[PDB]
Amino acid sequence: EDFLGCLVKEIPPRLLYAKSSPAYPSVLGQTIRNSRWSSPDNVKPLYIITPTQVSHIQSAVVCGRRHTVRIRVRSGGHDYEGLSYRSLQPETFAVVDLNKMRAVWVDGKARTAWVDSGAQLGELYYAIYKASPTLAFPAGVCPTVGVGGHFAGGGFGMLLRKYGIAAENVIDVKLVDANGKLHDKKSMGDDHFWAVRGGGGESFGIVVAWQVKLLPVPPTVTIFKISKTVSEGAVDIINKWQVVAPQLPADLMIRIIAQGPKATFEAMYLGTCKTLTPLMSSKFPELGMNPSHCNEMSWIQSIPFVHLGHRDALEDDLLNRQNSFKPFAEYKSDYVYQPFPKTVWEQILNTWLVKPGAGIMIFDPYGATISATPESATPFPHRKGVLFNIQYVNYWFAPGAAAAPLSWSKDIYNYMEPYVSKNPRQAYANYRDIDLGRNEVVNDVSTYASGKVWGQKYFKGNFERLAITKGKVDPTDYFRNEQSIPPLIK
Ligand SMILES: *Cc1cc2c(nc3c(=O)[nH]c(=O)nc-3n2C[C@H](O)[C@H](O)[C@H](O)COP(=O)(O)OP(=O)(O)OC[C@H]2O[C@@H](n3cnc4c(N)ncnc43)[C@H](O)[C@@H]2O)c(*)c1C
Ligand SMILES: [Br-]
Ligand SMILES: [Br-]
Ligand SMILES: [Br-]
Ligand SMILES: [Br-]
Ligand SMILES: [Br-]
Ligand SMILES: [Br-]
Ligand SMILES: [Br-]
Ligand SMILES: [Br-]
Ligand SMILES: [Br-]
Ligand SMILES: [Br-]
Ligand SMILES: [Br-]
Ligand SMILES: [Br-]
Ligand SMILES: [Br-]
Ligand SMILES: [Br-]
Ligand SMILES: [Br-]
Ligand SMILES: [Br-]
Ligand SMILES: [Br-]
Ligand SMILES: [Br-]
Ligand SMILES: [Br-]
Ligand SMILES: [Br-]
Ligand SMILES: [Br-]
Ligand SMILES: [Br-]
Ligand SMILES: [Br-]
Ligand SMILES: [Br-]
Ligand SMILES: [Br-]
Ligand SMILES: [Br-]
Ligand SMILES: [Br-]
Ligand SMILES: [Br-]
Ligand SMILES: [Br-]
Ligand SMILES: [Br-]
Ligand SMILES: [Br-]
Ligand SMILES: [Br-]
Ligand SMILES: [Br-]
Ligand SMILES: [Br-]
Ligand SMILES: [Br-]
Ligand SMILES: [Br-]
Ligand SMILES: [Br-]
Ligand SMILES: [Br-]
Ligand SMILES: [Br-]
Ligand SMILES: [Br-]
Ligand SMILES: [Br-]
Ligand SMILES: [Br-]
Ligand SMILES: [Br-]
Ligand SMILES: [Br-]
Ligand SMILES: [Br-]
Ligand SMILES: [Br-]
Ligand SMILES: [Br-]
Ligand SMILES: [Br-]
Ligand SMILES: [Br-]
Ligand SMILES: [Br-]
Ligand SMILES: [Br-]
Ligand SMILES: [Br-]
Ligand SMILES: [Br-]
Ligand SMILES: [Br-]
Ligand SMILES: [Br-]
Ligand SMILES: [Br-]
Ligand SMILES: [Br-]
Ligand SMILES: [Br-]
Ligand SMILES: [Br-]
Ligand SMILES: [Br-]
Ligand SMILES: [Br-]
Ligand SMILES: [Br-]
Ligand SMILES: [Br-]
Ligand SMILES: [Br-]
Ligand SMILES: [Br-]
Ligand SMILES: [Br-]
Ligand SMILES: [Br-]
Ligand SMILES: [Br-]
Ligand code: NA
Ligand code: NA
């Protein structure tokens, strides 16, 4: 009653929910993306707060501090492990859900915008579009991903080779810290501002809004999706790709989707078919790309096209808060610095991707701008020398059929170990993977040593600076989860 008592004093009760409340279950599930985490055996928050004003957030944090109830913040709910709305083990926590704070204010001529953390990527992209056909912002591919978690974890998509990650294009934030104080860049100091942009969600306070710079794109971009089965010589072509793709011009990204003995080469080119074809002919003719393969469209139209395959449905695809896609999902990731021997590609395509419960593998090439940024200039370390990133995606759709796909994710990660990065085995923070390791808690504080185990995988040489920053802004580890930066102090 103590915490709840505090909340009602400053926050409109229509914005507060207890498990008792009749609307609680729908408020909880509304942005859950993973059916694994909605089943009733999952630990649920004691309370849910849905602020509409920043002062509501400040009040929630103050109350939380005063009555020692911890807060997990949720924006888009896409956390792979569900850590924005569940804990792994029993504990008492409130979720602050930001889905009602979703405004996007674009300043077209200044090429900047303020975006609320509760807005979804689709909404941010659309608002930029309404302002200018030739402005863009380099973030992820999924339109329902929340801005808050995405930017905090770094965030990258089809513009990553041109402009880098979403986080390194943030010029200001509005943040509520572990004491309910509201900061921006001017008032928070450098480590905190460095850490919050890429150092992972939750750990560095609740970001209310982000100011971004908007970047130029041509009025026309070109997409292609070219498939090659192993019969068509996939293994030979993908073997070339791993060396060529990272050093293609920054205007050209070619990623690979593979879900059987067949590679799909998905490309975004910031230019026309006219100029892409000779470039392909010159730099990667092994693909056999020709003008029939070109899809010219605006940058904004490329967003639903890349994720769905649709070309027609702009407002529907970018502005959607229905969420009927709640699969059971498991994810892992890897980084690759030196080329695979062609035999590994053969095993992947012919053997591993044809197993029971086998998943999907996505290959994003780096190099160019993302790899130009020094490794420590942001908390995101996977930069110079990276050929490509790998995501291992596993979907299933029935509650009892978990064992085989889980077993495949585990088995293929083991298989790949010799061929991917090591000491540490690097991983992408926004592809959250609890099997990389979790925090131990001693005297109600996350330990540095337990945090180090996964932390060096996500953040490499930047982990210690993140922990020191944490130590400065949240020494009592108020804002934490099972995989959040532990405070390092003396
Ligand atoms: C579901 C999904 C995820 C995707 C998809 N595609 C991606 C892509 O093309 N590029 C990427 O870089 N990442 C992609 N991902 C992963 C997402 O980027 C991550 O899953 C994001 O972390 C998701 O953000 P969000 O939807 O906001 O997730 P939440 O569960 O709300 O938060 C995650 C994490 O961060 C903390 N957090 C949330 N909100 C805040 C604020 N305002 N301030 C600080 N910290 C915050 C949460 O506590 C939690 O720990 C494609 C798809 C379909
Ligand atoms: Br109080
Ligand atoms: Br009210
Ligand atoms: Br209610
Ligand atoms: Br419930
Ligand atoms: Br709500
Ligand atoms: Br649900
Ligand atoms: Br998910
Ligand atoms: Br519970
Ligand atoms: Br406000
Ligand atoms: Br207060
Ligand atoms: Br107390
Ligand atoms: Br506490
Ligand atoms: Br567990
Ligand atoms: Br779990
Ligand atoms: Br735990
Ligand atoms: Br201006
Ligand atoms: Br602005
Ligand atoms: Br308009
Ligand atoms: Br995304
Ligand atoms: Br979607
Ligand atoms: Br800046
Ligand atoms: Br504000
Ligand atoms: Br304040
Ligand atoms: Br401020
Ligand atoms: Br400043
Ligand atoms: Br100031
Ligand atoms: Br600081
Ligand atoms: Br994260
Ligand atoms: Br700027
Ligand atoms: Br341009
Ligand atoms: Br053009
Ligand atoms: Br196509
Ligand atoms: Br094809
Ligand atoms: Br082969
Ligand atoms: Br070839
Ligand atoms: Br190479
Ligand atoms: Br080249
Ligand atoms: Br270029
Ligand atoms: Br042409
Ligand atoms: Br040509
Ligand atoms: Br050739
Ligand atoms: Br066309
Ligand atoms: Br178009
Ligand atoms: Br066009
Ligand atoms: Br349209
Ligand atoms: Br909708
Ligand atoms: Br490697
Ligand atoms: Br290397
Ligand atoms: Br098998
Ligand atoms: Br460098
Ligand atoms: Br720095
Ligand atoms: Br290197
Ligand atoms: Br490089
Ligand atoms: Br299934
Ligand atoms: Br099974
Ligand atoms: Br399951
Ligand atoms: Br099995
Ligand atoms: Br090894
Ligand atoms: Br190591
Ligand atoms: Br490791
Ligand atoms: Br693992
Ligand atoms: Br513990
Ligand atoms: Br204690
Ligand atoms: Br404890
Ligand atoms: Br240590
Ligand atoms: Br390291
Ligand atoms: Br590093
Ligand atoms: Br470190
Ligand atoms: Na290494
Ligand atoms: Na997982």
Side-chain angles (χ1 to χ4, degrees):
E1 65 177 301
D2 59 351
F3 178 55
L4 187 56
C6 195
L7 294 176
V8 186
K9 292 183 71 68
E10 307 273 343
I11 304 174
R14 62 184 188 273
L15 302 185
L16 308 172
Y17 303 82
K19 296 167 68 173
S20 326
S21 301
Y24 173 97
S26 79
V27 161
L28 177 51
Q30 95 192 300
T31 52
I32 295 174
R33 316 297 181 162
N34 197 321
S35 284
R36 299 172 68 187
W37 314 140
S38 51
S39 61
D41 63 316
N42 287 279
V43 189
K44 311 197 190 289
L46 188 61
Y47 302 112
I48 304 183
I49 303 87
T50 67
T52 60
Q53 264 168 252
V54 46
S55 66
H56 300 164
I57 299 174
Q58 295 176 278
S59 291
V61 169
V62 170
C63 287
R65 293 303 312 290
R66 282 175 62 83
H67 299 271
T68 56
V69 175
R70 279 191 167 81
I71 289 168
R72 303 192 175 213
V73 56
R74 187 171 66 175
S75 294
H78 272 267
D79 193 274
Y80 284 177
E81 299 280 5
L83 297 204
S84 54
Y85 55 82
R86 70 183 266 259
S87 70
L88 305 186
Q89 294 309 329
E91 65 183 62
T92 295
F93 65 97
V95 167
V96 165
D97 186 307
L98 303 179
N99 85 89
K100 301 185 189 298
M101 306 181 71
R102 53 188 266 191
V104 185
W105 291 97
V106 177
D107 189 331
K109 279 196 134 327
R111 292 186 179 184
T112 59
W114 278 100
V115 50
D116 291 350
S117 286
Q120 272 165 21
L121 285 195
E123 287 143 25
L124 164 70
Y125 291 159
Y126 190 83
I128 294 164
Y129 167 57
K130 293 284 291 268
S132 164
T134 51
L135 286 181
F137 184 82
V141 167
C142 313
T144 67
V145 159
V147 165
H150 187 62
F151 288 19
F156 59 81
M158 295 304 303
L159 281 170
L160 74 77
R161 294 195 82 254
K162 185 66 172 182
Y163 290 126
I165 70 181
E168 70 189 295
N169 289 278
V170 171
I171 54 175
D172 205 350
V173 304
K174 259 123 180 222
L175 175 156
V176 173
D177 66 19
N179 303 303
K181 208 162 205 20
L182 179 66
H183 299 261
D184 59 357
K185 172 169 89 194
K186 202 198 130 184
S187 83
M188 73 174 69
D190 298 9
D191 280 343
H192 201 180
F193 190 63
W194 169 88
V196 72
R197 289 175 306 155
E202 178 80 16
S203 295
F204 298 103
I206 303 171
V207 183
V208 188
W210 312 71
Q211 197 190 25
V212 296
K213 64 168 152 176
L214 309 171
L215 300 153
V217 279
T220 283
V221 304
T222 305
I223 314 301
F224 67 69
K225 317 182 181 197
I226 300 182
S227 293
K228 300 292 182 181
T229 58
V230 292
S231 320
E232 302 173 296
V235 167
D236 269 18
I237 302 167
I238 191 167
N239 186 95
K240 196 84 181 102
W241 170 91
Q242 76 180 328
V243 166
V244 181
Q247 38 204 27
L248 292 175
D251 280 346
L252 175 53
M253 178 165 169
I254 304 171
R255 71 169 184 174
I256 293 176
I257 326 290
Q259 42 199 135
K262 163 176 162 264
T264 306
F265 293 79
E266 250 204 321
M268 176 150 90
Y269 178 62
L270 302 180
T272 54
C273 191
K274 204 182 95 182
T275 64
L276 175 58
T277 314
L279 175 62
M280 287 303 293
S281 152
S282 166
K283 298 295 179 62
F284 198 30
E286 295 85 334
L287 194 56
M289 172 269 168
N290 52 76
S292 58
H293 288 132
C294 296
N295 277 277
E296 297 191 347
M297 64 195 72
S298 63
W299 165 76
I300 193 64
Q301 273 170 352
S302 77
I303 301 302
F305 188 79
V306 161
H307 197 234
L308 306 184
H310 307 164
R311 350 197 162 188
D312 46 317
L314 200 53
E315 286 75 17
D316 185 52
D317 299 326
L318 304 184
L319 311 175
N320 160 64
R321 301 186 166 225
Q322 292 305 321
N323 191 36
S324 303
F325 197 59
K326 293 165 71 166
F328 305 78
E330 163 68 344
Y331 314 80
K332 300 186 91 71
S333 76
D334 261 323
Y335 277 95
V336 169
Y337 278 81
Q338 272 272 297
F340 289 174
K342 113 155 59 199
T343 196
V344 166
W345 286 125
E346 293 158 358
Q347 293 301 313
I348 291 171
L349 295 179
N350 295 311
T351 311
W352 284 98
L353 286 178
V354 197
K355 295 203 170 198
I360 308 158
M361 296 175 72
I362 306 171
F363 306 85
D364 286 353
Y366 282 21
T369 297
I370 196 170
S371 285
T373 301
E375 295 178 354
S376 70
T378 75
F380 180 103
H382 325 282
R383 307 254 187 202
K384 178 129 133 165
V386 173
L387 304 180
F388 56 91
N389 164 254
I390 306 176
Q391 198 191 176
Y392 312 80
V393 191
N394 250 281
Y395 293 137
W396 62 99
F397 300 90
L406 284 186
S407 176
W408 180 88
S409 297
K410 187 189 184 241
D411 290 350
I412 191 180
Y413 211 65
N414 187 60
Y415 170 76
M416 292 297 295
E417 183 164 43
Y419 316 112
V420 304
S421 78
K422 64 206 51 189
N423 301 309
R425 190 181 180 168
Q426 304 170 220
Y428 175 46
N430 266 334
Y431 295 162
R432 195 193 285 288
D433 178 1
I434 196 66
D435 294 315
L436 301 180
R438 80 183 67 179
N439 284 343
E440 185 183 340
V441 173
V442 172
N443 295 326
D444 199 41
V445 173
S446 300
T447 76
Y448 184 74
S450 65
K452 202 168 57 180
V453 178
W454 54 268
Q456 276 174 356
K457 297 174 188 165
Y458 289 155
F459 302 120
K460 213 170 172 181
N462 293 324
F463 180 71
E464 190 177 276
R465 186 181 175 184
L466 288 167
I468 288 170
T469 309
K470 172 73 167 182
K472 292 198 282 189
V473 304
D474 188 12
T476 70
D477 200 28
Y478 176 64
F479 287 134
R480 68 143 172 262
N481 53 47
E482 298 78 354
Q483 220 183 44
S484 57
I485 312 302
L488 181 60
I489 336 157
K490 303 302 167 183

